[PDB]
Every structure is written in structure tokens, then in C-alpha cells.
Amino acid sequence: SLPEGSFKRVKPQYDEIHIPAPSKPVIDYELKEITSLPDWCQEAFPSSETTSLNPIQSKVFHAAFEGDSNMLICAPTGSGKTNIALLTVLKALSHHYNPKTKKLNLSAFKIVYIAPLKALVQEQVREFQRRLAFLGIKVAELTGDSRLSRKQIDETQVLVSTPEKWDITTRNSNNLAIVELVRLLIIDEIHLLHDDRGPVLESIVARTFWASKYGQEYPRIIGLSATLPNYEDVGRFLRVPKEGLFYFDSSFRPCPLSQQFCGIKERNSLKKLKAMNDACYEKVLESINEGNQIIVFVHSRKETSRTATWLKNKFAEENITHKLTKNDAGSKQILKTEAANVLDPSLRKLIESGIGTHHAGLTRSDRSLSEDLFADGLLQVLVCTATLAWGVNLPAHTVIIKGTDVYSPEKGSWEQLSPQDVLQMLGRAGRPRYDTFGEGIIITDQSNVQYYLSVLNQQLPIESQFVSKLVDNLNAEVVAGNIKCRNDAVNWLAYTYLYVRMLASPMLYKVPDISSDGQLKKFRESLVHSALCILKEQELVLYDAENDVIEATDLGNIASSFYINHASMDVYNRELDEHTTQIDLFRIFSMSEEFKYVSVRYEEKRELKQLLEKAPIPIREDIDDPLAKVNVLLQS
Amino acid sequence: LGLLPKPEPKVKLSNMMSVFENDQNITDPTAWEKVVKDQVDLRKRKHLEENERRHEDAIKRRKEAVNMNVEKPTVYHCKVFQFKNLQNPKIRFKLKMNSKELSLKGLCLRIRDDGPGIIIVVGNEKSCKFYENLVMKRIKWNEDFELHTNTGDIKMDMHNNSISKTWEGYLQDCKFKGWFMKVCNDQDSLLRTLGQFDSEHFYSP
RNA sequence: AUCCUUAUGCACGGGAAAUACGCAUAUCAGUGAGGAUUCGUCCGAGAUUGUGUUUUUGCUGGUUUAAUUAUAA
């Protein structure tokens, strides 16, 4: 703690603590060069700028060729991960691909790359194409908007999928040949397990080990993640051999992250918000004089525009010219070409000032435009929601996170910024390629700073949320037919990620059994009981308490196929009726649980009002209710 | 500029009802009574405390106040008295302590017990005068006392015993390093005893 | 060693005023500022001049909802 805070500044509005940049790594190792590779692998790095691998990569690489084993990398994800995955891919290709005969063996190996987001999948795919073009490989996307069919999967070799669509592809019974063919299963951002999509990954993992026992040849599993505690427990979840585990701290990061907080001493929201804006302004003023390109995160998208307006009138009151003093002719040109043409959320004026913003709710084209302009650097300041850290790789020298309380429809309450989101926001930083270090900043209330220091140290385990997704995963598995009884269910649950975590800390995750049942036999079986009661109530699976026999129903099969959540499922069950009509169909569709996170907005409200007058299919609900918004959007 | 802690309202009983500091003005009535009351006694203590800090530290400055040596005064005030009977012990003890706290060069002689004799005190004028007030005024030399003797105490009649000032004045150089009461039985060894300090003439037959 | 006294300083509790207070390289002023009266005397430290604030100094109080993505084709 004491080494972390070096220096603290006290200011009238706020008390700011300035953490120094992390330490540079000790060298016990050799930087591994490219000429050490075999013949075909030397084009793995077609542009070899250093001709030597980064501090993280070399050791993990030679270990990766040396062993064929399940591996885990907890790393800054400083662009180091992309190349490592590429290299393991090339190894599998060489194992199925002869060194002498240069014909690539296409039908032997198959590869899967699990990237949480569609956009990041896209980016990855272009990377894999660039690096793998010399072998003559088809690298194509299996997920979502990708829209690959029954055939192209067979044709392709390397796959880049999102977790959801990969889950649904491997869940289906007919394709199992492809699943067996895949030798190489790469999991990017295994730290996702903390978040509620992570349940899908652990379910996929469980299916890989447990579900294919009739062919029974286990594929190579490579986890790739941001640095996280309880790495050992992660390995015990997967298989991981002790040597495959590589834990690298932030000292191995390309640009050391200078951590900074401002505690806010104010309480009432009207002065508190003003104090935050003042602090942000002060930071921006310190940054831009150094020629620093800056990002300011916020909670909500509506917050972005008003924040940028505040920076325009305030920042401009201070000095107008300095933001663009250079190439003002070309800045006027490019700015008018971009802002004036495609933008229509009254965001053009912000672009024109040269403080822009990016958020969900900005047009797809406008969105790409803002990214590009901020890359060129006519945009000095970029106000953003949480989309960028999660999605896009583009780093920016200074990163400010404004505020604590985010509203989550999960609770229906304002919670604190969750650590897993904070960390990935801090990830985008001073550019590893160009700049030397980053500036992280967190605009926050002082009382919660004590919390953010620790959670920002990344001492927090990847929390297992399997409790919510357990039921649906179990149903899908019964549909596969792999579980005929409670004992089978708990054996599958032994390879489940919550199992490990329970073993580590039973009372944290509410194991009553504790001393009893070291293997948590009765705890596992009790969860299965709990699941199969509600499933049976939803007529998803057949179950009997004392006799214990399991079988899958038609509704359960449907939920498995289209990956409907169990809540959505029972909603359909009751709300659909014999006499239900066209009006009620849209209402039920709206009621689908996947829209629970949807809510009506005040900038949306005028267009909603115009719609619902002329809407052909009537709405029983009203403008204030999100369901009505959903089904009118459906009509549109 | 932020360096120091922002102040906070002092809150008294009278003031307690008013304060809109966020803290349990009503909701916790008594727990709020608490923080207030202990707030006051916090301060009040700190007062007494601080006083004791300067008090003690200055007493250490009293040890240092002794550590300097006397800066012997270049010219010496003096006073001389003549008295029939010193026989009352508590007198003598007074004349021991008081002379001693007051840093008084000099002596006291007399003739055996009954013998009248001389009193000499030398030093700064401030102390010498006080010592005089002590001797002449407060202490009553016609006032009889009951003396401890071998078996017990008996009547000793002082109303004959009489004390009077001879004079007071200045002296070139004090030959007295410290003050001692003593006896020399005759007048001669008594006068001679003065004469070792060359003091014979101070006595008046 | 104890107490009182006096002045000054740090304080603590409490009240009072904020037509009050300042400030000034000003100008003078016990080597008399100023005043009084019973006309004999008595009283004995600030006044002038300019200037600034003065319904005030600092602070603090209440009314005019993140991202993301899943079908069998």
C-alpha cells in the first residue's frame, strides 16, 4: 500500500492521491527472437519490428511448444496475447501439417477462438488472416452477425466465435464431428467468469471435458486473461498443469499505468456534480498543455453530451485556440467533412469544437467516424460511455473515469463501479506502440476510495456467478442426454467452475455443508434437486425425488436449441394461451426476459410518441412502459 | 489550498438543537447527546491538558533555572541583629529553612544557649529585606516556649529575650560561601570565629 | 513551600456590539490633546486631516439510469 501511494496532493475541491507508475521488470530471461523459429513459423511475425518477443511472451511460447497441455496466461493483455495464440495455432497446424510436404492438412485440425464481443471477434479475425495467410487458411467468424451455415464450418479451419454462439453450436447434437475435430480451444478473457456471461464459458468448458467421452481425446485448452488472483484455483478448475500457469503482474505491462484518484468531499448532488466537473476540467487542463489525447468515461450516454457541452463552454471560456492551434485549416476541413455529413444526434457541434464523444446511441457510421478522428488526433478530448474499454483496442494517453454509481437493472439500484469493468477501463491507456506511459484517473466519492484502492490492486478473485445460469445449462445438458440422474448431474458439476470456488471458500458462496462432505457431494446433489424442481415446474425435464430418473422434454429441447433463459421460458409457458391473438403476441415477445435490461429514454420519447399514434398493431401498454417501446420497435 | 483539515462546527448544548449537521439530530436522540457531550469534554480536557504541558515543561526550565551559577553579586547588602535567646528550636528551624530557600550568605552566632549575640545576613537587597521582615516582625522573641530536654519539655521564659536591629549596609567582598548557625562558648572564640572571616567588629559588647 | 495582587500572553466558558472600527511615512500632542467652573480654580491624553468598510469577514447550508449477444434457414 505504502509503495503504491508515493505522493498525495490536497486541493480545495478534492483530495487527489497520485500513484507512481509500476516498476520495470527484472530480467532473468532471454528475449526470444524470430530467427529461432522453424521454416514456416518465421512469417508468424511478418512485420518484425523488434525481432524479439515482449517480456511476457518468449518463455510462455517455448513452454507452449514444449508441452501439449492446458495453459493459462494472466497478463496485462498488452497485445502480447494475440501473438501467443497465433503461435500455438501454428503449432497445432504443424502437428497436423508436415514440415517436408508443404500441403496443409485441412481436414485434420480445427481451431476455436472464444472472444467475448462481436467487434473484438472481427478485429481478431483480420489479425489471424494477416498472420496465417501463408499457409492458405480460411479464418472466418462463426458467431452472431457472422451468420455461418452448416457447410462453411466444415470448409473452414480456424474459427473465431463469441462465447454465446459457440455454446449454441457445440450444444447441438448433429455437429459433434466438428467438435471432435477441434484440437485447439482458445479462451480469450477468461476473467469474464466474474461477469454473468462467464457462466457460458464454464458451461462450454464443462461440455468439453465431460460431454465427449465416447471419442475421448481431450483438446488443448488455452486461457488468456487479464492478470487476476486465485490463478491456482483457476487451473484446478480447468486442468491446468502447474507449469502451464503463467502469472504476470502489471510490472510486465508495456506502458506502466499511473494510478490517480480524486476523492470528492461533497455530499449533495448539485454541488457534488459541479465539483466533479471542475476536477475533470483541471485534469484536462493539465493534460492538454503536454499534448495529451484524453478519454473521459461516464455512467450514462445522456451524461456524455452534457459533459462535452460543459467542457466546450468552460474549456473554451479558459482558452479556445490551444485545443486546435495546429493545422487549423485541415482540422476545419476534416472536421466539417466528418461532423457535417453523417452525424445527426446534435453531436456535430461537439465534434466541431474538437471535444467529441462516443456512445451506444451514436450511429454506426458516426461511431466509426469518431473512432477514426480520435485516432488521427483532431479530437483532443473524447467523452465516452463504457463501450470503448469493453470493445475497442484504441488506447489514449489520459483516461478519466467520472463517477461511482452506475444503475444496474439487475438490482434496480445504483451500485458502485464493478472492479472487472474498472480494470478494463484502466486497460486502455498510454499507447504501447507510441507513448511511454499512461495516466489513469478515477473521479470518485472519497468514502468509497478506500474500496477502489484495493479492488484496483486486482486482489479480487474472479467471482463465480453460476447460480443464476446453472438451471439453463443443466437443462441444455439433459437435452444433450448426457445426464440420466442426480449423480451424473453432480459429476458434471465437479468440472463446473463454481465447484472449485466452493471448495476454496465454502462460507463465502454459502456452502452450509462445510466440514461435512469434503467433495461437497450432498451440496452438489442439493443444487441439482433445487434445479430440477423448478425445471419440472416449467415442464423442462422429468424428475422424481426418491427414484431419481431424468429425461428431457420438448420444451426443454426448445430452450436448449434457441438458448432461451428459464425465466423467459416459463413466461412464454403461461403467457401463451389457446386464444392468444396478434396483439398479445407482441406483448409476450416484449415480456421476454432478454429485454429486462431495456428501458425507455427521454430523448427516445418524442419518436416513441410519434410512432404509437400511427402504429398498426395496437399496444395495450403505454409509452412509459419499456415493453410497449420494445414491441413498437419490433413493428418498425 | 487544502493542506489543513477543514473546520467543523463546535456544538454546545444550547446550540445542539439548531445544528443541521447531518448527524442524528432527532433519530438518535441520546446517541447524539453523546457525541456532543463528549465533544465538549474533549475540548475542556485539551485545555487542562495543554496547561499541564506548559506547566511541566516550564518546571524543566526550573531545573535549568537552577543550572546557572549565581553570577556572584558585585556588591553585597547586609543586615546585623542582636538577640538574647535563640533557645526556641522552631525559631532556629525557621532560621534554617527560610535562610536556606533564600540563598543567603552569612552566619548566625550566639553564646552557648542563654547567650545573646549576633545575626548576619548578606546578599541581594530583595532577599535580605524579606529575611528581615521574617526576623524582626513576624517572629515574637518575648514569646515563651516549651523546650524538649532530656526527659521532656519544660517552660522556657522568653519575655526577657529581646531582638533588635543593629544596622544594615554594604560590604566590599563577602567572605561567606554559605550560611551556618553555630556556637562558640566564650566571647573570644566567638569573636575570633568572626575574625576568621575578619568579622569580629560586627558584634557590639 | 502556599496565597494574594498587578500587568501581559495562551486559553476555556459566557455575554455584548457590529454608527463600529479601522488605517495613515499624515500632522501635531506632558516641552499640554483637550476640556470646566461655584471664576478661586479644576481636570490631564488624544485630537486633527485624509481615507476604507461599515443591512458586514470566511465557510456551510434548503426550494424555481451502464454493455451485449444468442436461433432451426
mmCIF file of C-alpha atoms in Angstrom, chain B residues 64-167:
data_model
loop_
_atom_site.group_PDB
_atom_site.id
_atom_site.type_symbol
_atom_site.label_atom_id
_atom_site.label_comp_id
_atom_site.label_asym_id
_atom_site.label_seq_id
_atom_site.Cartn_x
_atom_site.Cartn_y
_atom_site.Cartn_z
ATOM 1 C CA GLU B 64 17.641 24.720 34.022
ATOM 2 C CA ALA B 65 16.807 27.817 36.074
ATOM 3 C CA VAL B 66 18.972 26.358 38.843
ATOM 4 C CA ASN B 67 21.720 25.195 36.488
ATOM 5 C CA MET B 68 23.282 28.669 36.148
ATOM 6 C CA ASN B 69 25.846 29.679 38.780
ATOM 7 C CA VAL B 70 24.934 32.600 40.986
ATOM 8 C CA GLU B 71 26.701 35.303 38.928
ATOM 9 C CA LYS B 72 28.080 36.440 42.264
ATOM 10 C CA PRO B 73 26.804 39.962 43.034
ATOM 11 C CA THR B 74 29.469 42.602 42.800
ATOM 12 C CA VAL B 75 28.268 44.442 45.925
ATOM 13 C CA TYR B 76 26.628 42.899 48.930
ATOM 14 C CA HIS B 77 23.773 44.121 51.058
ATOM 15 C CA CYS B 78 23.948 43.208 54.723
ATOM 16 C CA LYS B 79 21.999 43.287 57.978
ATOM 17 C CA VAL B 80 23.034 42.622 61.571
ATOM 18 C CA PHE B 81 20.896 41.865 64.608
ATOM 19 C CA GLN B 82 21.325 41.211 68.310
ATOM 20 C CA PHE B 83 19.263 38.749 70.323
ATOM 21 C CA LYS B 84 19.166 37.345 73.837
ATOM 22 C CA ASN B 85 17.919 33.780 73.347
ATOM 23 C CA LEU B 86 17.714 31.582 70.250
ATOM 24 C CA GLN B 87 16.634 28.721 72.519
ATOM 25 C CA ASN B 88 13.309 28.046 70.804
ATOM 26 C CA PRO B 89 14.042 25.281 68.264
ATOM 27 C CA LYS B 90 11.242 26.081 65.789
ATOM 28 C CA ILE B 91 12.738 29.543 65.568
ATOM 29 C CA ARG B 92 16.109 28.013 64.678
ATOM 30 C CA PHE B 93 14.460 25.687 62.144
ATOM 31 C CA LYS B 94 12.682 28.642 60.586
ATOM 32 C CA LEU B 95 16.057 30.354 60.540
ATOM 33 C CA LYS B 96 17.436 27.226 58.872
ATOM 34 C CA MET B 97 14.905 26.618 56.082
ATOM 35 C CA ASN B 98 13.964 30.209 55.279
ATOM 36 C CA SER B 99 17.609 31.254 55.167
ATOM 37 C CA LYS B 100 18.198 28.182 53.020
ATOM 38 C CA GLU B 101 15.474 28.692 50.393
ATOM 39 C CA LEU B 102 16.650 32.299 50.086
ATOM 40 C CA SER B 103 20.278 31.559 49.180
ATOM 41 C CA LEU B 104 21.660 33.750 51.946
ATOM 42 C CA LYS B 105 25.378 34.037 52.556
ATOM 43 C CA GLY B 106 26.111 34.714 56.200
ATOM 44 C CA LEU B 107 26.089 33.089 59.606
ATOM 45 C CA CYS B 108 24.463 33.100 62.997
ATOM 46 C CA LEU B 109 26.376 33.034 66.256
ATOM 47 C CA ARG B 110 25.494 33.306 69.924
ATOM 48 C CA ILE B 111 26.973 32.478 73.319
ATOM 49 C CA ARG B 112 26.182 28.865 74.197
ATOM 50 C CA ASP B 113 22.428 28.749 74.786
ATOM 51 C CA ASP B 114 21.362 31.650 77.043
ATOM 52 C CA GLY B 115 23.879 33.996 75.467
ATOM 53 C CA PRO B 116 22.679 36.873 73.390
ATOM 54 C CA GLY B 117 24.585 37.501 70.211
ATOM 55 C CA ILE B 118 24.579 38.439 66.595
ATOM 56 C CA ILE B 119 22.795 37.754 63.321
ATOM 57 C CA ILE B 120 24.358 38.407 59.942
ATOM 58 C CA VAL B 121 22.786 38.157 56.512
ATOM 59 C CA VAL B 122 24.326 39.236 53.236
ATOM 60 C CA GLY B 123 23.173 39.130 49.664
ATOM 61 C CA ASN B 124 20.842 40.786 47.230
ATOM 62 C CA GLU B 125 18.709 43.510 48.700
ATOM 63 C CA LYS B 126 15.439 41.834 47.799
ATOM 64 C CA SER B 127 16.034 38.687 49.829
ATOM 65 C CA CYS B 128 17.787 40.348 52.753
ATOM 66 C CA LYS B 129 14.810 42.608 53.383
ATOM 67 C CA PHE B 130 12.315 39.776 53.361
ATOM 68 C CA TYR B 131 14.541 37.843 55.735
ATOM 69 C CA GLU B 132 14.374 40.901 57.955
ATOM 70 C CA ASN B 133 10.576 41.027 57.874
ATOM 71 C CA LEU B 134 10.731 37.383 58.888
ATOM 72 C CA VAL B 135 13.077 38.019 61.780
ATOM 73 C CA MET B 136 12.061 41.341 63.332
ATOM 74 C CA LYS B 137 8.333 41.391 62.618
ATOM 75 C CA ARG B 138 6.563 38.034 62.493
ATOM 76 C CA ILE B 139 8.673 36.125 64.988
ATOM 77 C CA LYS B 140 7.975 37.114 68.596
ATOM 78 C CA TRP B 141 11.069 36.978 70.802
ATOM 79 C CA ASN B 142 9.289 37.814 74.041
ATOM 80 C CA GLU B 143 7.016 34.820 73.461
ATOM 81 C CA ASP B 144 7.785 31.915 75.801
ATOM 82 C CA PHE B 145 8.176 28.356 74.558
ATOM 83 C CA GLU B 146 8.223 24.813 75.925
ATOM 84 C CA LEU B 147 11.523 23.094 75.184
ATOM 85 C CA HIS B 148 12.404 19.450 74.650
ATOM 86 C CA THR B 149 15.017 18.406 77.213
ATOM 87 C CA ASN B 150 16.492 15.051 78.229
ATOM 88 C CA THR B 151 13.330 13.627 79.826
ATOM 89 C CA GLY B 152 10.759 16.055 78.451
ATOM 90 C CA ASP B 153 9.615 19.594 77.731
ATOM 91 C CA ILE B 154 9.666 22.476 80.227
ATOM 92 C CA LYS B 155 8.799 26.171 80.455
ATOM 93 C CA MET B 156 11.361 28.461 78.855
ATOM 94 C CA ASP B 157 10.739 32.127 79.521
ATOM 95 C CA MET B 158 11.451 34.396 76.537
ATOM 96 C CA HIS B 159 9.682 37.585 77.598
ATOM 97 C CA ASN B 160 13.102 38.741 78.730
ATOM 98 C CA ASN B 161 14.650 37.573 75.439
ATOM 99 C CA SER B 162 14.918 40.559 73.120
ATOM 100 C CA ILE B 163 15.835 41.052 69.465
ATOM 101 C CA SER B 164 16.823 44.341 67.885
ATOM 102 C CA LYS B 165 18.408 45.634 64.707
ATOM 103 C CA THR B 166 21.945 46.832 64.868
ATOM 104 C CA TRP B 167 22.200 48.160 61.332
#
